[PDB]
Design a protein around this nucleic acid. Structure first.
Ligand SMILES: [Mg+2]
Ligand SMILES: [Mg+2]
Ligand SMILES: [Mg+2]
Ligand SMILES: [Mg+2]
Ligand SMILES: [Mg+2]
Ligand SMILES: [Mg+2]
Ligand SMILES: [Mg+2]
Ligand SMILES: [Mg+2]
Ligand SMILES: [Mg+2]
Ligand SMILES: [Mg+2]
Ligand SMILES: [Mg+2]
Ligand SMILES: [Mg+2]
Ligand SMILES: [Mg+2]
Ligand SMILES: [Mg+2]
Ligand SMILES: [Mg+2]
Ligand SMILES: [Mg+2]
Ligand SMILES: [Mg+2]
Ligand SMILES: [Mg+2]
Ligand SMILES: [Mg+2]
Ligand SMILES: [Mg+2]
Ligand SMILES: [Mg+2]
Ligand SMILES: [Mg+2]
Ligand SMILES: [Mg+2]
Ligand SMILES: [Mg+2]
Ligand SMILES: [Mg+2]
Ligand SMILES: [Mg+2]
Ligand SMILES: [Mg+2]
Ligand SMILES: [Mg+2]
Ligand SMILES: [Zn+2]
Ligand SMILES: [Zn+2]
Lengths: 100, 157, 73, 53, 92
RNA sequence: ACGGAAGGGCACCACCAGGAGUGGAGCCUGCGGCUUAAUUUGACUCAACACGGGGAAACUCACCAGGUCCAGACACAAUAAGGAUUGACAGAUUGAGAGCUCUUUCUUGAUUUUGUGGGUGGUGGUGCAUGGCCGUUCUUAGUUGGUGGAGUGAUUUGUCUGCUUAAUUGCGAUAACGAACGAGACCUUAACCUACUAAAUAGUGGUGCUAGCAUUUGCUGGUUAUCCACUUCUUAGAGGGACUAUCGGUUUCAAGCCGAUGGAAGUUUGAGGCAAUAACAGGUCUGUGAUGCCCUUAGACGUUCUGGGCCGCACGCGCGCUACACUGACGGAGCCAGCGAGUCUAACCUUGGCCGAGAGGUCUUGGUAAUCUUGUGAAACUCCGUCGUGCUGGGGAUAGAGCAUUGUAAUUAUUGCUCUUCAACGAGGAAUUCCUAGUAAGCGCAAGUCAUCAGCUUGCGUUGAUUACGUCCCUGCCCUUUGUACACACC
């Protein structure tokens, strides 16, 4: 049935809580799976002058957004799949499931 | 069908625009911030404020019109967006609530020192470890100069 | 801003006010008492015999099919 | 009239503007956010940007 | 500002139906979302409404959130010739 | 506060010993001045001058010559459905199928127009009326209450003689005790883990099928539905790890410092982020629908359309790019990175195939991205050769002609390509900048701005030196003592 679930958040511990509760659900239902593949986090850098105006010493500022991405592949019936998507959601965490 | 990077920065921009809209509109209700939770079947927006009765209005009229405004601007479908309001924990521990309180006091005509000392007293009595209130601008003078009121201890680093 | 001279011709010249004549829309009428028609009207089915064309000179100008009718009697 | 806004704005600094300040100069067109840099420095901690190094 | 009666009535009836309205601060846009009226006509109709106490406004990142009051809803009611307690944007 | 006063200690925005240099030449770009219809403008020691994220064709744009529109809400009054008012084919007019305006009549019908009041808008002025932000004084270690003590008092002590520290860091001394801020702690990042969790979106090995050489086992490879196993490399998550550990010296023998061994790592491990009190009448109303006051507000400084200009050049400065050649230029082969970006109601990064000398064009393809572009097969570099000390095949400005791309539009060449032209420059005077280890320096690469345009910046990695490990001589910083006719404080 071969679903993938990807989790593409910024909050690492919320993300890991979601991954953890999902995998323990998987093993209590006895579902084989490829474990949490932790993709390389990607750092949206933005470099700007601190100043609005032009004068001053040329001081710069690198703001960063860390995006942490994980995914898990499951083999399971669609009933457990749909209730899985019904459960295991958090604030500040974007999830998407995909079949095949 | 959008990149995850652009998805998340658009989420942040959505949060920021909502925050500025609410702090422009609900200044007089004690708007002390907001949260957003995406979900299947909907996205929900949890306002945290003080005057929940005024944010609600009669029969939720204001919640209704604000929900519809958000829907109309961010082009959500009717029902895909939900708003909840919540009586915020720890009113004294809100940097913005006390700020807007100072704003309304000074605008109704209270004095600078009376207002700031009342605020810092309320904060430190509300279980805070320290506070610091600064008032810059024109104070009884053409020349501008700052006042700094404090209590407890703060850190800066 | 030093000063403005308007070296252009000082020709504040904004247009008419849709010049207000007396009553208008004369078709014509007989004595006792039949009606007659001036202002030859359009040829378009979109104009249901309610609009007048114009006749400036050498041309007839329309009002509902507001410009699409041109062949001169 | 048909000449009020005729000049194209399919590109250039006149096509873009800040989504906050209606400014043409100082844009961050990166990641499709389109904010003047001053307003960005204001709204960054809201957007989810932070300083670490 | 001058504008056609049917356009103003489109604005006013949409406003009575929805309770509120939004108009991106884009003059010369020529096409408002949810209303085929000109964006300028939307903005200026609501402006003339605001100045006589009926509707109220916020700019908020170049978007002109407009929302109406009780004076506004009764004025629109008698304007559109609608019954007492027909419907506001206040249903549960 | 200052001192061409003392004492102690610090800094490569200071010196020493050196390295690369800049200033010398051509060009780019900013500023001044000059010129001009305008050449918009802010900023002038460090703390202005590749800064305004300012790499301006139009827009940007604020400037110049001109032309439209009104977006003058709302209230009152006036006119007024025998018509308030709006719009308009064609022509004249106009750069202009702008009725702008005029000719001529058609169209519309209460929304309007005029006046008054009152607003609105403004990249108009004031940054010396302000907020916020930023920079600097100030990258240094300094700052302040409470309660006691001294003093008539301003004020002082605490907050220190000494020693030590990057550090009011600490040992300690002690009319002060006990605290707070700052520093430190902290957060991020880079380095270690053959210990844990796993992973065809990262790999490795084996086994299947298969190409070639050897054949005698083997060697190099290919292989998506061949599966099997593993996670050393790679990713992350949770943790561990270094605390100057151990030893020897040295110090009242305390804080601590030096050396050696071990260790991935022993200059607070390295680099940064945050970063005090008090201030500058620093910068900014040209970022703000942040803004007070003044100005202007319908032939407007509003807004918008066309065309110019911001590039304008007798000269003077600043940041830089190219080089002045053999440690080299050129032609071939070899051939190795990392940080990162990328299409939706769009049209992005583009592989592959074909055409074209070239730029580039075209037919398809992958990718919303550890998956595809991309092993970004980068450059300097190495090996072979040509040249041969000749302003020379160094150098490649300045010109001419043509071909392509972006874009509505390139004419004061946007850029790219081809050919030809082949100038100064022969290592840079007075002066002066940066720098102590994977650092300088060389080398290019991604992103930012971006339709196109990098000689700039923000970061990245490749190659990788010399010379200190110290001093207070110059320039300045801190602490103390001292003197002072200084207090907008030695200008
Ligand atoms: Mg040194
Ligand atoms: Mg020297
Ligand atoms: Mg050089
Ligand atoms: Mg300095
Ligand atoms: Mg123009
Ligand atoms: Mg221009
Ligand atoms: Mg100032
Ligand atoms: Mg200021
Ligand atoms: Mg005392
Ligand atoms: Mg006493
Ligand atoms: Mg005391
Ligand atoms: Mg094989
Ligand atoms: Mg020892
Ligand atoms: Mg550190
Ligand atoms: Mg400002
Ligand atoms: Mg203007
Ligand atoms: Mg310029
Ligand atoms: Mg500079
Ligand atoms: Mg070579
Ligand atoms: Mg790579
Ligand atoms: Mg040459
Ligand atoms: Mg570029
Ligand atoms: Mg250009
Ligand atoms: Mg630049
Ligand atoms: Mg110097
Ligand atoms: Mg003396
Ligand atoms: Mg004096
Ligand atoms: Mg003197
Ligand atoms: Zn007709
Ligand atoms: Zn903005």
């Amino acid at each position: 049935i071969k679903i993938r679930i990807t989790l593409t958040s910024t909050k690492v511990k919320q993300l890991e809580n979601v991954s953890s509760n999902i995998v323990k659900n998987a093993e209590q239902h006895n579902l084989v799976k490829k474990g949490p593949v932790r993709l390389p986090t990607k750092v949206l850098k933005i470099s700007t002058r601190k100043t609005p105006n032009g004068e001053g010493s040329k001081t710069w500022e690198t703001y960063e957004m860390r995006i942490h991405k994980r995914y898990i592949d499951l083999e399971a019936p669609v009933q457990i799949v749909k209730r899985i998507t019904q459960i295991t959601i958090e604030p500040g965490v974007d999830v998407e499931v995909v079949v095949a | 069908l959008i990149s995850k990077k652009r998805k998340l920065v658009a989420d942040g921009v959505f949060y920021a625009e909502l925050n500025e809209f609410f702090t422009r509109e609900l200044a007089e209700e004690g708007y002390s911030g907001v949260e957003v939770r995406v979900t299947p079947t909907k996205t929900e927006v949890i306002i945290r404020a003080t005057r929940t009765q005024d944010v609600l209005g009669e029969n939720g009229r204001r919640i209704n019109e604000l929900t519809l405004l958000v829907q109309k601007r961010f082009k959500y479908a009717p029902g895909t967006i939900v708003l909840y309001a919540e009586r915020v924990q720890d009113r004294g521990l809100s940097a913005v609530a006390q700020a807007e309180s100072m704003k309304f006091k000074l605008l109704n005509g209270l004095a600078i020192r009376r207002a700031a000392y009342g605020v810092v007293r309320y904060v430190m009595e509300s279980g805070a470890k320290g506070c610091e209130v600064v008032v810059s601008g024109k104070l009884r003078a053409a020349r501008a100069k700052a006042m700094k009121f404090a209590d407890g201890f703060l850190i800066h680093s | 801003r030093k000063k403005k001279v308007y070296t252009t011709p000082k020709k504040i010249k904004h247009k008419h006010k849709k010049v207000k004549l007396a009553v208008l829309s004369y078709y014509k009428v007989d004595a006792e008492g039949k009606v007659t028609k001036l202002r030859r009207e359009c040829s378009n089915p979109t104009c249901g015999a309610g609009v007048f064309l114009a006749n400036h000179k050498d041309r007839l100008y329309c009002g509902k099919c507001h410009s699409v009718y041109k062949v001169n009697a | 009239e048909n000449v009020w806004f005729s000049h194209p704005r399919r590109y250039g600094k006149g096509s873009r503007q800040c989504r906050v300040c209606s400014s043409h100069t100082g844009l961050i067109r990166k990641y499709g956010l389109n904010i003047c840099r001053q307003c960005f420095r204001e709204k960054a901690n809201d957007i989810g940007f932070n300083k670490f190094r | 500002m001058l504008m056609p009666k049917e356009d103003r009535n489109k604005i006013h009836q949409y406003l009575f139906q929805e309770g509120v309205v939004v108009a991106k601060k884009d003059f010369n846009q020529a096409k408002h979302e949810e209303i085929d009226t000109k964006n300028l006509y939307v903005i200026k109709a609501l402006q003339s409404l605001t100045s006589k106490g009926y509707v109220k406004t916020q700019f908020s990142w170049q978007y002109y959130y407009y929302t109406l009051t009780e004076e506004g809803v009764e004025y629109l009611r008698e304007y559109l010739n609608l019954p007492e307690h027909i419907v506001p944007g206040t249903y549960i």
